Design an enzyme around this catalytic site. Structure first.
Site, PDB file in Angstrom:
ATOM      1  N   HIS A  54       0.509  -1.383   0.095  1.00 50.05           N
ATOM      2  CA  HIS A  54       0.542   0.042   0.067  1.00 50.05           C
ATOM      3  C   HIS A  54       0.781   1.577   0.303  1.00 50.05           C
ATOM      4  CE1 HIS A  54      -2.729   2.330   2.272  1.00 50.05           C
ATOM      5  NE2 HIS A  54      -3.872   1.951   1.275  1.00 50.05           N
ATOM      6  N   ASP A  68      -4.508  14.596  -1.106  1.00 48.97           N
ATOM      7  CA  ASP A  68      -3.681  13.898  -0.835  1.00 48.97           C
ATOM      8  C   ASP A  68      -3.135  14.504  -0.172  1.00 48.97           C
ATOM      9  OD1 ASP A  68      -4.492  10.740  -0.951  1.00 48.97           O
ATOM     10  OD2 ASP A  68      -4.629  11.519  -2.641  1.00 48.97           O
TER      11      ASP A  68
HETATM   12  P1  LIG Z   1      -5.712   4.771   0.469  1.00 47.81           P
HETATM   13  O1  LIG Z   1      -4.091   4.418  -0.923  1.00 47.81           O
HETATM   14  O2  LIG Z   1      -5.636   4.635   1.472  1.00 47.81           O
HETATM   15  O3  LIG Z   1      -7.691   4.551  -0.503  1.00 47.81           O
END
Ligand SMILES: *[PH-](=O)([O-])[O-]
Length: 492
Positions: free
Chosen positions: A427, A452
Protein backbone atom coordinates in the site's frame (compact mmCIF):
# COMPACT_ATOMS: atom_id res chain seq x y z
CA UNK A 1 22.85 23.27 -7.35
CA UNK A 2 22.93 20.98 -4.29
CA UNK A 3 19.23 20.23 -5.06
CA UNK A 4 18.68 19.70 -8.78
CA UNK A 5 15.58 17.48 -8.27
CA UNK A 6 13.65 19.87 -5.96
CA UNK A 7 14.61 22.85 -8.17
CA UNK A 8 12.96 21.19 -11.14
CA UNK A 9 9.85 20.14 -9.16
CA UNK A 10 9.58 23.68 -7.63
CA UNK A 11 9.70 25.31 -11.03
CA UNK A 12 6.85 23.08 -12.26
CA UNK A 13 4.71 23.79 -9.20
CA UNK A 14 5.08 27.54 -9.49
CA UNK A 15 3.77 27.31 -13.10
CA UNK A 16 0.95 24.89 -12.25
CA UNK A 17 -0.36 26.25 -8.92
CA UNK A 18 1.16 29.65 -8.01
CA UNK A 19 -1.87 30.73 -5.99
CA UNK A 20 -1.63 27.67 -3.74
CA UNK A 21 2.06 28.23 -2.80
CA UNK A 22 2.26 28.26 1.03
CA UNK A 23 -0.99 26.40 1.54
CA UNK A 24 -1.27 23.35 -0.72
CA UNK A 25 2.43 23.12 -1.63
CA UNK A 26 5.54 24.77 -0.21
CA UNK A 27 9.31 24.44 -0.43
CA UNK A 28 11.14 24.77 2.90
CA UNK A 29 14.69 24.46 4.17
CA UNK A 30 15.93 23.60 7.65
CA UNK A 31 14.10 20.30 8.25
CA UNK A 32 15.25 17.04 9.91
CA UNK A 33 14.35 13.41 9.30
CA UNK A 34 13.36 12.43 12.78
CA UNK A 35 15.17 9.15 13.58
CA UNK A 36 16.55 7.93 16.93
CA UNK A 37 20.16 8.08 18.07
CA UNK A 38 20.48 4.28 17.97
CA UNK A 39 18.93 3.64 14.51
CA UNK A 40 19.07 6.94 12.49
CA UNK A 41 17.10 5.39 9.64
CA UNK A 42 14.02 4.89 11.84
CA UNK A 43 12.45 8.16 10.63
CA UNK A 44 11.32 5.63 7.99
CA UNK A 45 8.17 4.28 9.59
CA UNK A 46 7.67 1.16 7.53
CA UNK A 47 5.23 -1.46 8.61
CA UNK A 48 5.44 -4.29 9.47
CA UNK A 49 9.22 -4.35 9.05
CA UNK A 50 9.57 -8.15 9.25
CA UNK A 51 11.75 -8.82 6.26
CA UNK A 52 12.62 -12.45 5.47
CA UNK A 53 9.98 -13.96 7.77
CA UNK A 54 6.75 -15.35 6.26
CA UNK A 55 5.34 -15.56 9.80
CA UNK A 56 6.11 -11.89 10.57
CA UNK A 57 7.21 -12.66 14.11
CA UNK A 58 9.37 -9.63 14.98
CA UNK A 59 7.50 -6.55 13.64
CA UNK A 60 10.15 -3.96 14.40
CA UNK A 61 8.46 -1.56 11.91
CA UNK A 62 5.06 -1.73 13.54
CA UNK A 63 6.47 -1.31 17.07
CA UNK A 64 8.41 1.83 16.10
CA UNK A 65 5.40 3.30 14.26
CA UNK A 66 3.03 3.06 17.21
CA UNK A 67 5.74 4.20 19.61
CA UNK A 68 6.63 7.25 17.43
CA UNK A 69 2.97 8.25 17.25
CA UNK A 70 2.74 8.26 21.01
CA UNK A 71 6.08 9.98 21.51
CA UNK A 72 5.13 12.83 19.14
CA UNK A 73 1.68 13.37 20.63
CA UNK A 74 3.01 13.09 24.20
CA UNK A 75 5.37 15.99 23.38
CA UNK A 76 2.49 18.31 22.34
CA UNK A 77 2.21 21.67 24.11
CA UNK A 78 -0.45 23.29 21.91
CA UNK A 79 -1.94 21.34 18.95
CA UNK A 80 -2.52 17.90 17.57
CA UNK A 81 -3.83 17.71 13.93
CA UNK A 82 -4.76 14.33 12.41
CA UNK A 83 -6.19 13.36 9.07
CA UNK A 84 -6.91 9.92 7.65
CA UNK A 85 -9.34 7.83 5.58
CA UNK A 86 -12.34 6.35 7.41
CA UNK A 87 -12.77 4.28 9.50
CA UNK A 88 -11.55 6.44 12.39
CA UNK A 89 -8.42 5.10 14.17
CA UNK A 90 -8.96 1.86 16.11
CA UNK A 91 -7.01 -0.83 18.00
CA UNK A 92 -3.48 0.09 18.99
CA UNK A 93 -3.52 3.17 16.68
CA UNK A 94 -6.30 4.66 18.84
CA UNK A 95 -4.43 3.43 21.94
CA UNK A 96 -1.32 5.33 20.82
CA UNK A 97 -3.30 8.54 20.32
CA UNK A 98 -4.97 8.27 23.69
CA UNK A 99 -1.69 7.46 25.43
CA UNK A 100 -0.02 10.48 23.88
CA UNK A 101 -2.81 12.86 24.77
CA UNK A 102 -2.75 11.62 28.39
CA UNK A 103 1.05 12.03 28.48
CA UNK A 104 0.80 15.64 27.23
CA UNK A 105 -2.05 16.49 29.65
CA UNK A 106 -0.03 15.18 32.64
CA UNK A 107 2.94 17.36 31.62
CA UNK A 108 0.50 20.32 32.20
CA UNK A 109 -0.59 21.24 28.66
CA UNK A 110 -3.95 22.47 27.28
CA UNK A 111 -4.44 21.23 23.71
CA UNK A 112 -6.50 21.90 20.66
CA UNK A 113 -7.05 18.73 18.65
CA UNK A 114 -8.59 18.13 15.20
CA UNK A 115 -9.26 14.71 13.68
CA UNK A 116 -10.57 14.73 10.09
CA UNK A 117 -11.57 11.78 8.02
CA UNK A 118 -12.64 11.28 4.47
CA UNK A 119 -15.69 9.10 3.89
CA UNK A 120 -17.97 7.54 1.26
CA UNK A 121 -21.64 8.61 1.04
CA UNK A 122 -23.43 9.09 14.10
CA UNK A 123 -19.83 8.04 13.41
CA UNK A 124 -18.03 11.36 14.29
CA UNK A 125 -20.03 11.94 17.53
CA UNK A 126 -19.49 8.29 18.52
CA UNK A 127 -15.71 8.53 17.97
CA UNK A 128 -15.60 11.80 19.95
CA UNK A 129 -17.50 10.04 22.78
CA UNK A 130 -15.18 7.03 22.80
CA UNK A 131 -12.07 9.21 22.86
CA UNK A 132 -13.46 11.45 25.61
CA UNK A 133 -14.21 8.36 27.76
CA UNK A 134 -10.81 6.78 27.23
CA UNK A 135 -9.12 10.12 28.13
CA UNK A 136 -10.64 10.36 31.62
CA UNK A 137 -9.52 13.46 33.53
CA UNK A 138 -7.17 14.30 30.59
CA UNK A 139 -10.22 15.41 28.52
CA UNK A 140 -10.61 18.49 30.76
CA UNK A 141 -7.34 19.73 29.07
CA UNK A 142 -8.47 19.20 25.43
CA UNK A 143 -10.66 21.10 22.98
CA UNK A 144 -11.65 18.48 20.35
CA UNK A 145 -13.03 18.69 16.77
CA UNK A 146 -13.92 15.48 14.92
CA UNK A 147 -15.37 15.38 11.40
CA UNK A 148 -16.07 13.10 8.46
CA UNK A 149 -16.27 14.70 5.01
CA UNK A 150 -17.07 14.13 1.38
CA UNK A 151 -16.34 16.85 -1.17
CA UNK A 152 -17.85 15.28 -4.29
CA UNK A 153 -20.08 12.20 -4.55
CA UNK A 154 -19.99 12.27 -8.37
CA UNK A 155 -16.14 12.55 -8.55
CA UNK A 156 -15.68 10.14 -5.61
CA UNK A 157 -13.71 12.87 -3.80
CA UNK A 158 -12.96 12.96 -0.06
CA UNK A 159 -9.92 13.16 2.25
CA UNK A 160 -7.34 10.43 1.78
CA UNK A 161 -4.37 12.28 3.36
CA UNK A 162 -2.83 10.57 6.41
CA UNK A 163 -1.10 13.20 8.51
CA UNK A 164 -0.20 13.62 12.17
CA UNK A 165 1.15 17.11 12.95
CA UNK A 166 2.04 18.19 16.48
CA UNK A 167 2.60 21.89 17.38
CA UNK A 168 3.36 22.55 13.74
CA UNK A 169 6.84 21.23 14.63
CA UNK A 170 6.64 17.45 13.98
CA UNK A 171 4.86 15.59 11.21
CA UNK A 172 4.18 11.99 10.32
CA UNK A 173 2.73 11.23 6.91
CA UNK A 174 2.44 8.49 4.37
CA UNK A 175 0.22 5.68 3.19
CA UNK A 176 -0.75 4.09 6.56
CA UNK A 177 -4.45 4.08 7.45
CA UNK A 178 -5.16 3.58 11.15
CA UNK A 179 -6.94 0.24 10.57
CA UNK A 180 -6.12 -2.49 13.14
CA UNK A 181 -7.53 -5.37 11.02
CA UNK A 182 -5.43 -4.68 7.94
CA UNK A 183 -2.14 -3.58 9.57
CA UNK A 184 -1.88 -5.01 13.11
CA UNK A 185 -4.04 -7.96 14.33
CA UNK A 186 -3.43 -10.22 11.39
CA UNK A 187 -0.85 -12.75 10.17
CA UNK A 188 -0.91 -11.18 6.68
CA UNK A 189 -0.25 -7.52 7.55
CA UNK A 190 -0.34 -4.82 4.83
CA UNK A 191 3.11 -3.46 3.91
CA UNK A 192 3.19 0.33 3.90
CA UNK A 193 5.29 3.31 4.94
CA UNK A 194 5.14 6.70 6.63
CA UNK A 195 7.96 9.19 7.30
CA UNK A 196 8.66 11.26 10.43
CA UNK A 197 10.13 14.78 10.17
CA UNK A 198 10.45 17.97 12.07
CA UNK A 199 10.97 21.56 11.03
CA UNK A 200 9.30 24.10 8.76
CA UNK A 201 7.82 21.33 6.51
CA UNK A 202 5.57 20.30 9.46
CA UNK A 203 4.19 23.85 9.26
CA UNK A 204 3.38 23.21 5.61
CA UNK A 205 1.27 20.22 6.68
CA UNK A 206 -0.50 22.38 9.25
CA UNK A 207 -1.39 24.92 6.53
CA UNK A 208 -2.70 22.10 4.27
CA UNK A 209 -4.95 20.93 7.11
CA UNK A 210 -6.21 24.50 7.71
CA UNK A 211 -7.15 24.46 4.00
CA UNK A 212 -9.19 21.32 4.44
CA UNK A 213 -10.78 22.42 7.75
CA UNK A 214 -11.61 25.89 6.32
CA UNK A 215 -13.75 24.07 3.71
CA UNK A 216 -15.08 21.61 6.31
CA UNK A 217 -16.19 24.33 8.78
CA UNK A 218 -17.90 26.23 5.92
CA UNK A 219 -19.88 23.17 4.91
CA UNK A 220 -20.61 21.81 8.37
CA UNK A 221 -24.37 22.55 8.09
CA UNK A 222 -24.59 20.60 4.78
CA UNK A 223 -25.33 17.01 5.85
CA UNK A 224 -24.52 15.56 2.35
CA UNK A 225 -20.96 16.96 2.85
CA UNK A 226 -19.92 17.02 6.52
CA UNK A 227 -20.66 15.35 9.87
CA UNK A 228 -19.06 17.40 12.71
CA UNK A 229 -18.76 16.76 16.47
CA UNK A 230 -16.94 18.89 19.11
CA UNK A 231 -16.16 18.62 22.85
CA UNK A 232 -18.49 20.69 25.07
CA UNK A 233 -19.37 24.18 23.77
CA UNK A 234 -16.45 24.28 21.33
CA UNK A 235 -16.93 25.66 17.81
CA UNK A 236 -15.23 24.46 14.57
CA UNK A 237 -11.62 25.48 14.22
CA UNK A 238 -10.91 26.19 10.53
CA UNK A 239 -7.56 27.81 11.19
CA UNK A 240 -6.16 26.17 14.38
CA UNK A 241 -2.75 25.95 12.82
CA UNK A 242 -2.46 29.57 11.74
CA UNK A 243 -4.08 30.79 15.00
CA UNK A 244 -1.96 28.67 17.40
CA UNK A 245 1.49 27.91 15.86
CA UNK A 246 4.27 30.19 14.45
CA UNK A 247 3.91 31.11 10.76
CA UNK A 248 7.38 29.68 10.20
CA UNK A 249 8.17 26.65 12.40
CA UNK A 250 11.60 26.49 14.05
CA UNK A 251 14.48 24.96 12.11
CA UNK A 252 15.74 21.54 13.20
CA UNK A 253 18.29 20.45 10.61
CA UNK A 254 19.47 21.05 7.07
CA UNK A 255 17.08 18.99 4.94
CA UNK A 256 15.28 20.62 2.00
CA UNK A 257 11.69 19.51 1.37
CA UNK A 258 8.73 20.19 -0.89
CA UNK A 259 5.36 19.65 0.76
CA UNK A 260 2.66 19.00 -1.82
CA UNK A 261 -0.97 18.07 -1.78
CA UNK A 262 -4.18 18.37 -3.71
CA UNK A 263 -7.71 19.57 -3.20
CA UNK A 264 -9.45 16.79 -5.19
CA UNK A 265 -12.82 17.94 -6.54
CA UNK A 266 -15.47 20.06 -4.81
CA UNK A 267 -13.38 22.36 -2.61
CA UNK A 268 -11.97 24.76 -5.22
CA UNK A 269 -12.53 24.44 -9.07
CA UNK A 270 -9.38 26.27 -10.27
CA UNK A 271 -6.37 28.35 -9.08
CA UNK A 272 -7.39 31.81 -10.50
CA UNK A 273 -3.79 32.94 -10.42
CA UNK A 274 -2.58 30.05 -12.59
CA UNK A 275 -1.61 30.64 -16.25
CA UNK A 276 -0.61 27.01 -16.75
CA UNK A 277 -1.17 25.86 -20.35
CA UNK A 278 -0.46 22.15 -20.53
CA UNK A 279 0.22 20.20 -23.73
CA UNK A 280 -2.17 17.36 -23.03
CA UNK A 281 -1.31 13.91 -24.52
CA UNK A 282 -3.61 11.82 -26.65
CA UNK A 283 -5.31 9.10 -24.90
CA UNK A 284 -6.63 5.96 -26.67
CA UNK A 285 -7.39 3.22 -24.10
CA UNK A 286 -7.39 5.01 -20.75
CA UNK A 287 -11.04 6.17 -20.79
CA UNK A 288 -12.79 2.79 -20.90
CA UNK A 289 -16.12 4.51 -21.19
CA UNK A 290 -17.23 7.56 -23.54
CA UNK A 291 -19.27 9.74 -21.20
CA UNK A 292 -16.79 9.91 -18.31
CA UNK A 293 -15.11 13.23 -17.54
CA UNK A 294 -11.39 12.53 -17.05
CA UNK A 295 -9.89 14.87 -14.44
CA UNK A 296 -6.51 13.09 -14.56
CA UNK A 297 -5.81 13.48 -18.25
CA UNK A 298 -8.22 16.06 -19.66
CA UNK A 299 -8.95 18.84 -17.13
CA UNK A 300 -6.45 21.67 -16.95
CA UNK A 301 -8.25 23.43 -14.13
CA UNK A 302 -8.11 20.22 -12.04
CA UNK A 303 -4.33 20.19 -12.35
CA UNK A 304 -4.10 23.69 -10.96
CA UNK A 305 -5.84 22.66 -7.71
CA UNK A 306 -4.01 19.29 -7.57
CA UNK A 307 -0.30 20.21 -7.75
CA UNK A 308 0.74 16.79 -6.37
CA UNK A 309 -0.10 15.06 -9.76
CA UNK A 310 2.27 17.45 -11.53
CA UNK A 311 4.84 17.20 -8.71
CA UNK A 312 5.08 13.37 -9.05
CA UNK A 313 5.37 13.58 -12.86
CA UNK A 314 8.16 16.23 -12.42
CA UNK A 315 9.97 14.05 -9.85
CA UNK A 316 10.07 11.22 -12.43
CA UNK A 317 11.20 13.70 -15.14
CA UNK A 318 14.12 14.86 -12.93
CA UNK A 319 15.87 11.44 -12.71
CA UNK A 320 19.30 11.05 -14.30
CA UNK A 321 20.07 7.42 -13.43
CA UNK A 322 17.28 5.39 -11.89
CA UNK A 323 13.76 5.55 -10.46
CA UNK A 324 12.14 3.12 -8.03
CA UNK A 325 8.35 3.18 -7.61
CA UNK A 326 6.52 1.09 -4.97
CA UNK A 327 2.79 1.36 -5.11
CA UNK A 328 -0.38 -0.56 -4.58
CA UNK A 329 -1.13 -0.04 -8.29
CA UNK A 330 -0.22 2.10 -11.24
CA UNK A 331 -3.67 1.60 -12.81
CA UNK A 332 -7.16 2.32 -11.50
CA UNK A 333 -10.50 0.54 -11.93
CA UNK A 334 -12.49 1.93 -14.82
CA UNK A 335 -15.16 3.04 -14.44
CA UNK A 336 -15.42 5.41 -12.62
CA UNK A 337 -11.77 6.45 -13.01
CA UNK A 338 -9.62 6.33 -16.16
CA UNK A 339 -7.26 3.36 -16.29
CA UNK A 340 -3.99 5.31 -16.09
CA UNK A 341 -2.27 8.71 -15.94
CA UNK A 342 -1.10 9.23 -19.57
CA UNK A 343 1.48 11.89 -18.70
CA UNK A 344 3.01 9.69 -15.99
CA UNK A 345 3.44 6.73 -18.33
CA UNK A 346 4.84 9.13 -20.96
CA UNK A 347 7.37 10.45 -18.48
CA UNK A 348 8.48 6.96 -17.54
CA UNK A 349 8.76 6.01 -21.25
CA UNK A 350 10.80 9.16 -21.98
CA UNK A 351 13.16 8.11 -19.21
CA UNK A 352 13.57 4.53 -20.45
CA UNK A 353 14.14 5.75 -24.03
CA UNK A 354 17.11 7.70 -22.61
CA UNK A 355 18.48 4.69 -20.72
CA UNK A 356 17.37 5.71 -17.24
CA UNK A 357 16.39 2.54 -15.37
CA UNK A 358 12.83 2.22 -13.96
CA UNK A 359 11.65 -0.22 -11.29
CA UNK A 360 7.98 -0.64 -10.56
CA UNK A 361 6.79 -2.97 -7.76
CA UNK A 362 3.06 -3.29 -7.19
CA UNK A 363 0.65 -5.37 -5.10
CA UNK A 364 -0.02 -9.02 -6.18
CA UNK A 365 -3.20 -9.20 -8.33
CA UNK A 366 -4.17 -12.21 -6.14
CA UNK A 367 -5.30 -9.51 -3.71
CA UNK A 368 -8.07 -8.41 -6.15
CA UNK A 369 -9.20 -4.14 -2.26
CA UNK A 370 -5.33 -4.15 -2.54
CA UNK A 371 -4.97 -4.58 -6.34
CA UNK A 372 -6.77 -3.19 -9.39
CA UNK A 373 -5.13 -5.24 -12.13
CA UNK A 374 -5.30 -8.85 -13.23
CA UNK A 375 -1.79 -9.07 -14.59
CA UNK A 376 1.46 -7.06 -14.74
CA UNK A 377 0.96 -7.11 -18.49
CA UNK A 378 -1.55 -4.25 -17.96
CA UNK A 379 1.41 -2.04 -16.89
CA UNK A 380 4.01 -3.39 -19.34
CA UNK A 381 1.68 -3.22 -22.39
CA UNK A 382 0.86 0.40 -21.60
CA UNK A 383 4.50 1.37 -21.09
CA UNK A 384 5.37 -0.33 -24.40
CA UNK A 385 2.65 1.48 -26.31
CA UNK A 386 3.75 4.88 -25.00
CA UNK A 387 7.42 4.00 -25.74
CA UNK A 388 6.32 3.19 -29.32
CA UNK A 389 5.34 6.82 -29.88
CA UNK A 390 8.99 7.92 -29.24
CA UNK A 391 11.08 4.98 -30.44
CA UNK A 392 9.38 4.63 -33.86
CA UNK A 393 7.44 1.40 -33.30
CA UNK A 394 6.51 -1.66 -31.27
CA UNK A 395 9.73 -3.73 -31.74
CA UNK A 396 12.01 -0.77 -30.71
CA UNK A 397 9.58 -0.06 -27.85
CA UNK A 398 9.85 -3.60 -26.53
CA UNK A 399 13.62 -3.52 -26.72
CA UNK A 400 13.85 -0.16 -24.79
CA UNK A 401 11.49 -1.54 -22.17
CA UNK A 402 13.33 -4.85 -21.71
CA UNK A 403 16.69 -3.04 -21.55
CA UNK A 404 15.53 -0.50 -18.90
CA UNK A 405 12.61 -1.91 -16.80
CA UNK A 406 12.19 -4.00 -13.63
CA UNK A 407 8.51 -4.90 -13.18
CA UNK A 408 7.28 -7.19 -10.35
CA UNK A 409 4.74 -7.85 -7.62
CA UNK A 410 5.65 -7.51 -3.96
CA UNK A 411 6.98 -10.05 -1.52
CA UNK A 412 8.71 -9.56 1.81
CA UNK A 413 10.12 -13.10 2.28
CA UNK A 414 11.21 -16.06 0.09
CA UNK A 415 7.62 -17.41 0.19
CA UNK A 416 5.28 -16.44 -2.67
CA UNK A 417 2.61 -15.63 -0.04
CA UNK A 418 2.39 -15.12 3.70
CA UNK A 419 2.71 -18.38 5.65
CA UNK A 420 -0.99 -18.08 6.55
CA UNK A 421 -1.72 -18.47 2.81
CA UNK A 422 -2.92 -14.86 2.14
CA UNK A 423 -1.09 -12.85 -0.57
CA UNK A 424 1.16 -9.95 0.42
CA UNK A 425 -0.71 -6.68 0.09
CA UNK A 426 1.36 -3.53 -0.45
CA UNK A 427 0.00 0.00 0.00
CA UNK A 428 3.10 2.32 -0.24
CA UNK A 429 2.96 5.55 -2.20
CA UNK A 430 6.68 5.78 -2.68
CA UNK A 431 8.88 7.17 -5.48
CA UNK A 432 12.66 7.53 -5.12
CA UNK A 433 15.10 8.78 -7.83
CA UNK A 434 18.87 8.74 -8.00
CA UNK A 435 19.42 7.53 -4.44
CA UNK A 436 18.82 11.25 -3.80
CA UNK A 437 15.24 12.49 -3.83
CA UNK A 438 12.06 10.72 -2.75
CA UNK A 439 8.31 11.07 -2.24
CA UNK A 440 6.53 9.49 0.72
CA UNK A 441 2.90 10.40 1.16
CA UNK A 442 -0.72 9.38 0.49
CA UNK A 443 -0.93 10.21 -3.24
CA UNK A 444 -1.26 7.07 -5.34
CA UNK A 445 0.14 7.12 -8.82
CA UNK A 446 -3.07 5.45 -10.19
CA UNK A 447 -5.88 7.87 -11.19
CA UNK A 448 -7.59 9.28 -8.06
CA UNK A 449 -9.40 12.60 -7.40
CA UNK A 450 -8.99 12.81 -3.62
CA UNK A 451 -7.45 15.25 -1.15
CA UNK A 452 -3.92 13.87 -0.62
CA UNK A 453 -0.58 15.08 0.79
CA UNK A 454 3.08 14.13 0.94
CA UNK A 455 6.69 15.26 1.12
CA UNK A 456 9.43 15.26 -1.51
CA UNK A 457 12.79 15.12 0.36
CA UNK A 458 16.19 15.71 -1.33
CA UNK A 459 18.83 14.11 0.94
CA UNK A 460 21.18 11.45 -0.47
CA UNK A 461 21.90 10.27 3.03
CA UNK A 462 18.23 9.67 3.76
CA UNK A 463 17.68 8.11 0.34
CA UNK A 464 20.51 5.61 0.99
CA UNK A 465 18.85 4.72 4.29
CA UNK A 466 15.59 4.20 2.31
CA UNK A 467 17.52 1.88 -0.03
CA UNK A 468 19.06 -0.19 2.75
CA UNK A 469 15.98 -0.46 4.95
CA UNK A 470 13.17 -0.75 2.35
CA UNK A 471 13.90 -0.78 -1.37
CA UNK A 472 16.82 -3.26 -1.27
CA UNK A 473 15.00 -5.81 0.97
CA UNK A 474 11.94 -5.30 -1.24
CA UNK A 475 13.75 -6.07 -4.49
CA UNK A 476 15.64 -9.00 -2.86
CA UNK A 477 12.35 -10.90 -2.30
CA UNK A 478 10.12 -9.32 -5.04
CA UNK A 479 12.50 -9.86 -7.92
CA UNK A 480 11.42 -13.55 -8.14
CA UNK A 481 8.00 -12.43 -9.53
CA UNK A 482 9.44 -10.10 -12.21
CA UNK A 483 8.07 -10.26 -15.75
CA UNK A 484 10.66 -7.76 -16.92
CA UNK A 485 14.13 -7.39 -15.33
CA UNK A 486 16.90 -5.75 -17.35
CA UNK A 487 19.57 -6.77 -14.75
CA UNK A 488 19.01 -10.48 -15.51
CA UNK A 489 17.81 -10.21 -19.14
CA UNK A 490 14.22 -11.30 -18.26
CA UNK A 491 11.69 -10.12 -20.85
CA UNK A 492 8.33 -11.89 -20.84
P1 LIG B 1 -5.77 4.88 0.03
O1 LIG B 1 -4.55 4.44 -0.83
O2 LIG B 1 -5.60 4.60 1.52
O3 LIG B 1 -7.11 4.57 -0.58
Amino acid sequence: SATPHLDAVEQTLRQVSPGLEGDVWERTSGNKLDGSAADPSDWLLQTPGCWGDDKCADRVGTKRLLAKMTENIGNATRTVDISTLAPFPNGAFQDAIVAGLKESAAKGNKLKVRILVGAAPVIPSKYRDELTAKLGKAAENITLNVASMTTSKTAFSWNHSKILVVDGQSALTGGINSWKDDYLDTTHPVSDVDLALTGPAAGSAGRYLDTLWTWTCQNKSNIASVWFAASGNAGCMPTMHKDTNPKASPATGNVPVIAVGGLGVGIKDVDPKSTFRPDLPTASDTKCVVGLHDNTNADRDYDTVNPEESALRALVASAKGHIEISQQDLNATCPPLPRYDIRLYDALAAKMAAGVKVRIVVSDPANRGYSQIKSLSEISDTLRNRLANITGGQQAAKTAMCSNLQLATFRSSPNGKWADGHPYAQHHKLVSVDSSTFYIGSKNLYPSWLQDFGYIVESPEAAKQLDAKLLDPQWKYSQETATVDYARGICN
